[PDB]
Amino acid sequence: DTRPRFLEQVKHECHFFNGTERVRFLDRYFYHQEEYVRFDSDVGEYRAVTELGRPDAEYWNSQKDLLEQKRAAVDTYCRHNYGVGESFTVQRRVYPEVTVYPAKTQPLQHHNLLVCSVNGFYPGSIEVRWFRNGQEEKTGVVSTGLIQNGDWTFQTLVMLETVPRSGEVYTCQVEHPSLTSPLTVEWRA
Amino acid sequence: EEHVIIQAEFYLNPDQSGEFMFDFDGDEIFHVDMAKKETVWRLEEFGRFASFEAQGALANIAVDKANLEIMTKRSNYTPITNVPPEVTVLTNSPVELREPNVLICFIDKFTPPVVNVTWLRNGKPVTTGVSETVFLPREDHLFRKFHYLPFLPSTEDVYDCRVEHWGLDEPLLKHWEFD
């Protein structure tokens, strides 16, 4: 199927700062990936983003009832829906599972990578740090970065490139909003 | 900002596909199944705390369809440029032999929102237990999508996620195997 495609998108966005203390509403219209016209609650009228959206901006701004619907959205739409979903979205907290296992940077070579696997947590903000015998190790740390799993959980792998010596104790430390104190996991050579 | 909630919609020609969903900070709250006219919550628990009248989504999609007709003419029938996906396969937890796990195929940064995705086990299509998300919006107004395959890890099986998209010259296969 080589037939040309044509796409329309609309995004009605509610942006929240400090709960519902400060709220911004965006009514956004798209042709393919190109935003062509938008209502910003900061402005209170539609504005063309590209030339393609000028006829709609002028037409929509001539409709007073429509504009007042859009102008009230921060209250009737954004603050309302926030209230509806707050208990299972804003307040959602799921603890990370933390696993440490050794790995290899190159096949055949001895174990030279320590993986701190942090799984199943929500929300996404997390800080993972490595320690060797009580000292933070900041060199040789590489990560997958923050991975969304698509099911309201995140995961991340944080690896420490190191050559483990007998006796050494490594510690992976995890800080996250769901925790009241750091979560630490030890690994011994 | 602390949080963002987005009601995201699209309508696509000539496929006549239209989607309606709510996004919270990048996760899907729910979408509306247009054929069934039903609200589908991403996590089942959500529907115990909130409701949504699916019929309302239908009205918006009808307007989006009509708006697409208008904008297509206005653009002098300029079609979309295909953007092929990035594909990644990962597990949702550390793999242990014969411990139930889940393979995730993440299909990202693509448009239009049409893709064929197949899970392969030892080169063979598998459909038992698979699941998938709808098309999810990106801040750059491309799309992403997730496919899932529960599996029992073994040394005897290899997996691939196979993705077909009009922006690709050949199907994209991303491999996974134990080790």
Partner: peptide, 13 residues
């Protein structure tokens, strides 16, 4: 309770 939706606006012409 009930999640509300925002209307999509019919375009000109």
């Amino acid at each position: 309770s009930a999640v509300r939706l925002r209307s999509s606006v019919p375009g000109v012409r």
